[model samples]
Target: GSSGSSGVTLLVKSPNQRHRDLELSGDRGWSVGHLKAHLSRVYPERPRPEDQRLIYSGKLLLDHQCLRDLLPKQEKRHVLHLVCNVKSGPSSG
Candidate 1:
């Protein structure tokens, strides 16, 4: 743990017009790997987890990084935008 309280509420904005204002949360003070685990629940029958790309705060999140450090301190709740692409390039597991 990063020495703080666990869990955070993150608002996920849909890139597509069909969807909007979906929310995500980090139940644990976890890394981007944890983020995808959370994403799977929110997005049912979604594309491959590897295909899911997390973009937040003008930064494309890396699996090794924890949300606690990457997220902004000014606001407790933040918005996460993820783009799922399969054929673009290789991403981490």
Candidate 2:
């Protein structure tokens, strides 16, 4: 019953030579930044990784977004929507 599209994915090039899919399944109370912290823990390669912004319904989640603020917080799990891009740091021209 994996009733979800497999379109979700993330790409990161950590110096530790590690990476993994960011799958956060839990209460929606968590903010966008908090979720990113969770993923950072899972992949130690990216120590103190960057926080990712979660976008849903065309709205960007700010730090104020949390489980308590969520209207129906107890009913469903929150899935963070994000995207990771590769950057060359303005080099290798």
Candidate 3:
């Protein structure tokens, strides 16, 4: 489940499934951090990234409510993609 509107697409991925888009909307200032929180709620079993390396483009999400107002800047392109999957490796957070 997501909260979005307009042409914006929210991709809510399952822990063991391919990525798919969902409808979502919210404030741009919501930050990629907030988006990660939403993903955590949806895929509770999924692992979260560690700080510093957490906000990559592949993990960042768009806010439908503020899509037109904000744009993906080069500086923010490294934001982490919020794709969900089982936690593995030694330091799974």
Query: lDDT per residue, candidate 3, 16-82, as tens digits?
Result: 3445533343234554555555556554454453221122334444433243244342332122334
Q: Name the better of 1 and 2 by lDDT.
A: 1
How close is every model to the real structure, measured as TM-score? 0.72, 0.45, 0.38
Output the TM-score of candidate 3: 0.38
Greater-TM-score candidate between 1 and 2: 1
Q: Which run of 10 residues does model 1 get worst, by summed lDDT?
A: 17-26
lDDT of 3 at 9: 40
User: Which tens-of-lDDT digit does each residue in 1-93 have in candidate 1?
Assistant: 646665778776657833766676664477787677568667764655666677786578878787878886666678887665556656787
Once fitted onto the true fold, the runs of candidate 1 whose alpha carbons sit more than 4 angstroms away are 2-6, 86-93
lDDT of 3 at 38: 57
Query: In model 1, how many backbone clashes occur?
Result: 0
RMSD of each: 6.0, 9.6, 8.8
| Model 2 ranges with Cα > 4 A deviation | 1-22, 43-51, 71-76, 85-90
Question: Model 3: which ten-residue window has the lowest total lDDT?
Answer: 49-58
Model 2, 6-56: lDDT tens digits are 223222223232343354443344544665666556644453324544454
In candidate 3, position 32 carries an lDDT of 50
